[PDB]
Structure formats: C-alpha cells, structure tokens
Amino acid sequence: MLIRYKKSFEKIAMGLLSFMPNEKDLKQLQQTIKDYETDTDRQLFLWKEDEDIVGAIGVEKKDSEVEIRHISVNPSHRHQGIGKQMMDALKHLFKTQVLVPNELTQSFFERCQGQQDQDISYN
Ligand SMILES: CC(C)(COP(=O)(O)OP(=O)(O)OC[C@H]1O[C@@H](n2cnc3c(N)ncnc32)[C@H](O)[C@@H]1OP(=O)(O)O)[C@@H](O)C(=O)NCCC(=O)NCCS
C-alpha cells in the first residue's frame, strides 16, 4: 500500500531514489529528500509490500496538474506490477487533479497508460 514519507525511512528512501538516473551521488540524494520534507508542493510516497518498503514515488503539485518526478522500485521486486500499482494508487489519491509526468519519468508513465487494466466482467 501507498504511505506518506516519514523521517524514519530516510535510509531506504535515499537508497530507492538512488536508482533514478539523475541521482548520481549521495550528496544530491539528501538534498532532494530535504526538498520533499521542507517543500509543501512536493510530497514523497513509499510502497509497503507486506512490511518492507520496496518502492518510492514522489510528485510535485502544480496548480492544476500533479507532476511525477521520481519513481523507483527495488530491483529485487521489479517486474511484479509494483511500479504500476503505485501509479494506480497515486491516481486514486490525486483524483482531484490530472496526473502528468516530467521528462524524467515519461517513458514508464506512457507504458502504464497504454496498458489495459485487467478487470473482471459480468453478464
Ligand atoms: C521503472 C521502474 C520504477 C518500474 O518498476 P516495476 O516494478 O518493474 O514496474 P511494473 O512491474 O509494473 O512493469 C514492468 C514493465 O515496465 C518496463 N519498464 C521498466 N523500466 C522502464 C522504463 N524506464 N521505461 C519504460 N518501461 C520500463 C519493463 O520493461 C517492464 O515491461 P515488460 O512487462 O514488457 O517486461 C523500475 O524499473 C525501476 O526502478 N527503474 C530504475 C530507473 C527508473 O526508475 N527510471 C524512471 C522510469 S522512466
């Protein structure tokens, strides 16, 4: 499930966000984590499979659109649908505004939109 970021998860949040291509070193990591903590328009979320944090997704609220900036899943948990479940839970969470990506996560975002939601059908 999707939970808000807490300071007690800084070590795992930095480790997860380190897989983002624009996060080269650790000095830059703690600066972006400090942005998610101290900036109102920027919020970071964590995906808790069972009781272990395996994914992370952070957004920036900008007037009418909610831009996705960072999305990362633990490599040992990839290819399990966690990446799309985070966005789906994010879309339900931000039902008020429209969910758009930036140039950093446009590739994986367009893949999920092209995907078909696997739903049951009756009659
Ligand atoms: C992108 C990422 C967050 C998705 O995690 P995930 O749990 O594997 O997502 P899902 O299980 O729901 O779906 C996996 C699919 O997404 C694809 N995928 C993985 N990374 C992708 C990417 N950057 N762009 C487009 N598709 C990607 C996989 O090829 C896979 O496709 P397949 O089913 O045909 O094999 C994960 O691969 C990751 O941590 N990447 C590190 C770098 C990064 O996150 N860059 C930003 C993404 S644009």
Side-chain angles (χ1 to χ4, degrees), residues 13-30 32-49 51-60 62 65-90 92-94 96 98-103 105-110:
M14 286 191 299
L16 288 173
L17 292 185
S18 63
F19 301 104
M20 210 72 184
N22 64 320
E23 310 295 331
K24 288 89 175 184
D25 40 283
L26 196 90
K27 165 190 173 67
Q28 182 183 358
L29 284 171
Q30 64 187 25
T32 62
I33 292 295
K34 201 67 177 182
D35 288 356
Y36 284 132
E37 296 178 352
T38 65
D39 198 324
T40 316
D41 302 332
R42 293 185 175 177
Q43 269 295 319
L44 180 64
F45 301 93
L46 305 177
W47 187 261
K48 215 164 72 176
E49 191 84 347
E51 270 293 303
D52 222 62
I53 304 182
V54 300
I57 179 167
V59 300
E60 174 182 358
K62 318 181 70 62
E65 313 189 311
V66 176
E67 194 178 38
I68 306 180
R69 296 178 60 86
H70 305 109
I71 176 168
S72 172
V73 188
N74 197 29
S76 187
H77 288 73
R78 294 179 186 176
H79 310 292
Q80 292 184 7
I82 295 176
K84 190 169 183 295
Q85 288 183 16
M86 287 192 302
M87 285 191 173
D88 284 358
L90 193 77
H92 290 302
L93 180 55
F94 289 93
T96 301
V98 63
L99 207 61
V100 300
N102 69 334
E103 300 169 24
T105 180
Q106 187 181 27
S107 182
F108 183 70
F109 184 86
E110 291 173 345

